[PDB]
Each structure stands twice: as C-alpha cells, then as structure tokens.
Amino acid sequence: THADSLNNLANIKREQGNIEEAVRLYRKALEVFPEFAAAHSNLASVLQQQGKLQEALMHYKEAIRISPTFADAYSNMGNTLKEMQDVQGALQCYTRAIQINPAFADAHSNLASIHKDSGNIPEAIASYRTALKLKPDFPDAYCNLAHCLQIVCDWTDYDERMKKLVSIVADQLEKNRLPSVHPHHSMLYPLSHGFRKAIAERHGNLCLDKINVLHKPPYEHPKDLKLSDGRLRVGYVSSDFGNHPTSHLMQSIPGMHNPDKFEVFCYALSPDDGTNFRVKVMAEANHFIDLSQIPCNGKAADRIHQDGIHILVNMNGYTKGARNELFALRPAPIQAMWLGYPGTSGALFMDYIITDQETSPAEVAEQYSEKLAYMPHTFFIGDHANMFPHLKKKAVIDFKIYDNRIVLNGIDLKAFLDSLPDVKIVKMLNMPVIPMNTIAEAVIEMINRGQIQITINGFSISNGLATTQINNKAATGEEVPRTIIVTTRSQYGLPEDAIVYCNFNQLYKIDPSTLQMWANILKRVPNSVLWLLRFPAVGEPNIQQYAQNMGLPQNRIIFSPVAPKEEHVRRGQLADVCLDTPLCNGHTTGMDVLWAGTPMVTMPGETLASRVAASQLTCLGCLELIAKNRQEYEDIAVKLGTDLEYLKKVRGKVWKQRISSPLFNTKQYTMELERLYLQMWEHYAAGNKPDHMIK
C-alpha cells in the first residue's frame, strides 16, 4: 500500500518528464516491497526509454517471475531484446506472450514485426492479420501490414487500403500520437505533402525529446575559419560507410575535396564491415571517426563539436542506423540533409536539404521544412566511373547488328579484339563487332554449357553469370574485374528478337496504375517483354496474376534473380529501354541503368522520390525521356520500342552523355558541392539565418 503510493508518485514524476525522480521513486517502492510486479514493469519501461536496455532487462525478468501470467511483460521484454539485437530472444518472448494470452493483439503484431524484419513477409502478413482479427482498430498493425502488402505487390482492395491509411494518419496527427506510417514510406501512399512533412516532424521531435533529458546547453559555434587555417570543416555523418548504396554513390567524394579550402571529417555510425568501400573512405577523408564506438549521443555530439565542424551533413535521415539525436543536439552551426534520404526531415534542427531545381522546384518548397540548397545540375551522384570502368566501352558478337544481344566488356577488351582477324567497327565512340565464326562459337558454347570461363588467344573470357566464382570482390564492386566478361540475353532467358523493357527496382515501388501503364505499352509493341527482378521472389506470383488479369500472357514478363552489384549494372546493357516507376523512381537504380547506356522513361510526380529520375535525365541531357502524364509515358515508351532508328539515336545519346554530361563526374560534383558549402557558410558568417540557396 505504501509501495503502491510510491509507484503512483513515480508515475506522476514520470509523466511530468522528470525521469530521474521517477526512477528514484520506483526504486523506493521496490525497497519497501521487493515483489512488486508493476513497479518492476514500470521501471523497466522507463529504463528502456532512457536507452538503458541491460538494466531494463533485469526488471522485466523480475516481473515475469512474480506474475507468470503477465503476458504484457513478456511482450515488452521482447521489445527490449529486439532493440538489443537479440532476435531469437525477442521471438521467444513474443511466443511466450501469445501462449500465455492467445488474445493478445500487440504480441502478434510484435511477432509479425520479427518475421517482417527477417524478410519472411507471408508469416509477417499472417501474424498482422491475426492481430487485426483480435483488435480491428490497431494503427501500427494495419500500417505495417500495408507495407508488407506493398513489398510483395499484393493489391487486394488497394484503393480502400490507401484511403484507410490516409484516415489513420489524419487521426493520429490530430490526436498528437506518433503516426503509424513511417516517414521513409510516406511517399508510397497518397498522403498530402502537408501530412508527409508532419509525419517527418513527429520523428524529428522524438529525437529532440531524447536529447532534452541530457540537459545539455547549446553549443558555441565557430564564427569564422581562423582556427581552421581558412578551411571549412565539413562533417559527413553516415551509418553507410561500407557495402551499401550510399557508399556506391559517394565514396569518391571525400578524397576529391580541395584540402586548401576544406577539411573533411567522416563520422561513421556503423562498425567497419571489412569492405573496400570502408577502406576507401577511411583512407581518403582527412579525419575518420568511428562513432559506433561511442553509443552516448551526448558524448558523440561533444566529439563532433570539439572537432570544430562548420557544416554537418546528415546522410541518413530516417533510415536504418541513423542517429539523428546527434543533429538534434546541434553541434554545428549549419546542418544539411544530403543524398541518403529522399524526403524532408521535417525537423527544426536541419537547416538545408541539398537538392536541385528539377528534383525540388521552388514552387514546392512547402513540402520541406528545410531551406532548399540547389546543386546546379542534379543532387544525385554515383561512383560508376570509378567502380565500373570496364563498362565504359563494349563490343558485341554478331551471331546471325544488335548492340545488346551478346556483349563483351573488359579493361583489356581492345587488346583482345586486336588479336582477332575479322573485327568490324560500327560507327556510333565506336562499337566493335566480332563475326559469328570460331571464336564466337566457343563463347556461346561456354554460356550454353554453364562453363565458368575460357581462354582465347591467351585472354581470359569469363561467363558473366559466374563472377562470384572468379573474383568475389569484383562481383560486389569492391574491385574492378581483371578479366573480359561476356553478357548475353540467353543467360537470362530474354528473347533474341524482341524489345526488352526493364525495371530493376525492388518491387514495392510498383503500384496498380504503373503495372497498367506497362501492360498498355507491351500490348502496343508486339515483339516485347518486361524484365523485372525477384525483389523479393514472393512478389513474382502477384505481379504475374495482375498481368494475366490485364490480358498479358505469362511470357510477356521475364523475372531474374537479384544479382551481385557488378552483374546487376552490367546486365542493364541487355535491355533496350528502362521503364521507371512513377510512384518512387529508381535512384541508385536509375544511375545503374544509365551507366549501361540504357534510356530510362520517367514520369516525374510531386514528391522528391518521384522526381529523381527526371533530374538525372535532365542532367544527362535527355529531356525527351521525361513524360508529363501517363499517355506521354506510354507514347514515349512505344516510340522507343517501335521506331528502331529513333531507339538507336536515343541509346547513342545516353551512351555518349553518361561520360560527357556531368551526371557521373564526381570531381565536378564535389567542386559544385564545395561552391554550395561556401555559399551556406558566407550566409551564416554574415549573421543570417538559413534561406533558400537557389542561385
């Protein structure tokens, strides 16, 4: 009873926001009455919210002992183990919770989340439906289920699903509860830009709440560049310095910074994964700091501020591994969103978003909480010229002239061709063509027999399907291949005599309208196939059913497995045209396809994520590939598939311009980034708050 009043007082001080007093009071309750299940479960929750997970675990363990029918404690303990990255442990706890109380909606949803996060979507879908059976009104489960359905392209009752999602978010924003739609997913559903920004802002506020309990004073920021010898100190903060799309885009940038005017600090939020991507950034940044070793956001922010950072760059936003608390602490006078996160942070602690006029026209500044800071062409960049230089040139084997049926690439391809007698050079640089003779038969025999490699005139000729067996580092893009590689339509079951439209994105980017658009295109172009990826495989049968319902025979759509990085980029050369997803474009994936010289058709929308491909195309200098509406998207796609002379001209433009335009020019990109940084700095140095930098 006294222990009861103590627990009550603790709860009060907790609600007040005074967590230390709350803890003191819960402990007093335990001191008075040690076997108090509720005091333990309450103190555990509090500790868990403070990020004191090991300590919270002690108390969850007490609660479950004392009250063996306490399903809530098992479930909550499960959440804590999940946060500790004990995946089996958490599952064990959710499993016990459901055994103790089969009617426990939350525990099913939490179990569903383990299945989801483990990639097992159908079991995830099963457990969420059970949750929703038990508790019809359950925003977390409904929205998480909606995302699972998105991942596998299950579009049952799609329109009503989309309406309910919107209604759920409207109600949560109104009732001031954290929305159940994750900000990184909000571009997928027809939410207003206002709602999308508001969701983001709610997540920003979570970070502020977390750091407010540190009771840290604001940091004193440098007011000039004197202590840094006239250099601007730029800090890049990322959990993705390693094998991840982010590094595949920007790994060359730190080492291209001009050391006379910039001092580059890379703050890693992840441990070293042993890959060359991490080696490169560690070797080329002026300073590399492993914040994965500094879990306290207060101590980590202190570290950033001690380094004297002028501009701190958020490369995560609301993506895995983020520590936006670091930015909420504002250790630097200017903080900018860049590259990793395709939307607004919605957060007051972020000053700028680095974007461009095509991605983020000034008209839509309202979609962002940040001021817009424009790069002069696109904000997008990719490391393709450095990672995949063997794809700068190609040769083909004429096996009957097609540029995308049987393709060769290699650092030493010229030397190989030179050892060959009857090579013809078709003018476009140029495309060498090898005749269907002895050497060409040996190549196709390799492919047909599944052989890994052969030797011709002393040159190593590799089967492009076998790169992991030849050099695994070349396969992942960590090293440039040192053999000549053969890529062919037959390797993938693609028709030798038809137009191939590709899209190599994860399937969640496709929606019913998009597939209908694609079906309309295929119907208009008799000799054509759509080439997609099992991304994931369990999406394949859903896409096929919807396609069949649209009157497309099974053989109009060809699926390939997801491939190692190098093979993925290289096999884009086999396609005629890429059909970009309007809901959420290819981003990294768009750069990948363009590096192969493959025209991409796009229809830019209103969200940042729906406009990236058009920005890439605009930089590339291919305005004709950007559609203003669905009819133009279809007409563009069909013209490319049927006017073969036009197709040749467009592919030729792409092929040349991926080099001559700024799109893949990392040095030029870095220099333009530097100009932008200096604009930001001079603006702040003159005593101004952030304003749009739209030159």
Partner: peptide, 14 residues
C-alpha cells in the same frame, strides 16, 4: 542476391 547479400536503403525502427 541469393547466396550473398544486396544491401538496400531502408527505414529505421520505430
């Protein structure tokens, strides 16, 4: 990819 891994951009937990 099957037999290896293909990292992608993804949402942080909430």
């Amino acid at each position: 990819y099957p037999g290896g891994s293909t990292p992608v951009s993804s949402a942080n937990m909430m």
